[PDB]
Amino acid sequence: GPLLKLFDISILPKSGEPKLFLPVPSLPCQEAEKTNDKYVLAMAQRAMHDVPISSKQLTANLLPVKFKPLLSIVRYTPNYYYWVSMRKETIASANLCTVAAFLDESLCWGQQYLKNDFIFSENGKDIILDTSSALLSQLVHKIKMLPFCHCLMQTTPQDHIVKQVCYLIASNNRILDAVRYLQTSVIKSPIVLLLAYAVCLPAAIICTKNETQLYSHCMRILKEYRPGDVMNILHESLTQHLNKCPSSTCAYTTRAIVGTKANTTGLFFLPTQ
Amino acid sequence: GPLLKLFDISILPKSGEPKLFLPVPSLPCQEAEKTNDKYVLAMAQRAMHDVPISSKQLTANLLPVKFKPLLSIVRYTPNYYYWVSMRKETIASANLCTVAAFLDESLCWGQQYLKNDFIFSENGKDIILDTSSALLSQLVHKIKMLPFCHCLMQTTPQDHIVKQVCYLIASNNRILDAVRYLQTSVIKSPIVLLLAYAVCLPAAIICTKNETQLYSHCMRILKEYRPGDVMNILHESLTQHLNKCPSSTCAYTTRAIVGTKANTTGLFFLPTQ
RNA sequence: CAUUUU
Ligand SMILES: [Zn+2]
Ligand SMILES: [Zn+2]
């Protein structure tokens, strides 16, 4: 007979006059930051804007002296939700250049936690660490968009690992299950190593006292990292790929995922050797 | 003995220069578009730039007269991979403002196919329809990131349908399985309706004659759409949420996912009533 | 859907 109705007519909008913009919920004004340190205040003023990323370079062996000054904002700002929201906006709309920059920043920051005997916890109010889960999800989304030849044209592709780690995160954000799975094999692909680097901080933050062994594995990964590894791994893999992939279309699919340049809104620094 | 080695050291790149960019090849110069229609040529020149979206508004009463002239570029351009890669770059880095604009464009374009008895094909070389799957995946990514009060604070949330459709697309791009699931129920939430609108053209493109029932359902959805509905549905939902949700954290997180303005790079027109 | 993929 007649078909089943498609939808209830009551859910359609009350007005059919054209809307050119979505609502912007303007939010309260920011309080003054709680520091008089003019280097730290300058770093925050530049983090608020999309500065060319070369201007934000910070040599990693100078980061130790800057860590405690920068904590006055990164850990103790009165504008916590404003800063986290700013950074999540950039990450949720990030190309792979932007993802890579934020990953290197977060991992160098995490290594300073270790150097200073800080513990990792989700109640720690840290505007860099508290966007690391959003960043892991974004990295997985970029890897799933790349043509499959990027994973298959590595010396030891470990494609089954890439596929299962991406499924666990994309399907239901199963962060600790992804660590459990990564523990079962030696890592032999640089793409798998990027995923391990990206999972270690958001997993460590959510471990309870019943998951001390998983926490310990996350700290092994964090300690092996060296400043700049995420940018260095991707720069090398993408160059080799252009020199060997025979597809007539891969380069165009890939350029759109990688992007033209990074967006540094919310990024305090790009750490390098 | 020691624990299992973390990774084979050979996968790390040689330390060399500090990396401040990621490599992509440079684009060749453009060929001339195959038309002398000044109106079409002007629309394509604007499409190349992130100009304010009010300057790209098109009343959908005019789209039927412009459809055939515009095919000279959308369907027969000698610059196919330039246009599709430009549009996929914008969509893969898109906030929800941008996703909504491109969805309305694609749905109105698909309606002109239907009105003219054109068929939908994976190899049809259409720079608008060939980005509709990327757009579906990005809409699902945005819905997953919104605080869940957005889906639950609806008259009839159908929260189980939203979650399962999002699972099917995000886990394995199971587009036809998502249509099959949607066809079982009357749609009673605006969020579910947005997902139905976003799925109908990517599904129509990959249906064969062995999926004639699912194809018919996709054509039912496409015919019921009214130009501008994606922006109008999202504007009403976000306006009424802002009035009713009491969470301060929700406002900050929502602003991050929605964004403050659309990126129109690669967008030809924003269709409206 | 009831942890759905491998
Ligand atoms: Zn390739
Ligand atoms: Zn809310």
Residue numbers in the entry:
A (entry chain B), B (entry chain A): 145 to 417
Authors' own words:
ORF57/Mta interacts with PAN RNA via a region termed the Mta responsive element (MRE), stabilizing the transcript and supporting nuclear accumulation. We also obtained the high-resolution structure of the C-terminal IHD from hvsORF57 in both the presence and absence of a PAN RNA MRE oligonucleotide fragment. The C-terminal IHD of hvsORF57 forms a compact homo dimer, approximately 65  ×  60  ×  40 Å.
To investigate PAN RNA binding to ORF57 from the structural perspective, purified hvsORF57Δ146 mixed with a 3-fold molar excess of a 17-mer RNA oligo matching bases 34–50 of PAN (PAN17) was screened against crystallization conditions, and produced diffracting crystals. The hvsORF57Δ146-PAN17 diffraction data was solved by molecular replacement with Apo hvsORF57Δ146 coordinates. The conformation of hvsORF57Δ146 was unchanged from that observed in the Apo form, with a Cα RMSD of 0.6 Å (residues 147–417). Within the uridine-quartet sequence, the second nucleotide binds to protein chain A while the third binds chain B, with the linking ribose-phosphate bridging the protein homo-dimer. Specifically the PAN RNA bases U45 and U46 form a π-stacking interaction above the sidechain of Y311, a pair of hydrogen bonds with the sidechain of Q308, plus one hydrogen bond with a water molecule, which is also coordinated by the sidechain amine of K307. The planes of the aromatic Y311 sidechains are angled approximately perpendicular to each other and therefore the U45–U46 bases that they bind are complementarily angled with a tilt of –95° and twist of 112°, the RNA therefore is bent in order to facilitate this protein–RNA contact. The structure of the C-terminal IHD RNA binding site is suggestive of binding preference for pyrimidine and likely uridine bases, and the bent conformation of the RNA as it contacts ORF57 is indicative that the nucleotides should be flexible and not constrained by base-pairs. The four residues K307, Q308, Y311 and R318 of hvsORF57 that contact the PAN RNA oligo are conserved in ksORF57 and the Epstein-Barr virus (EBV) homolog EB2 (R3 site).
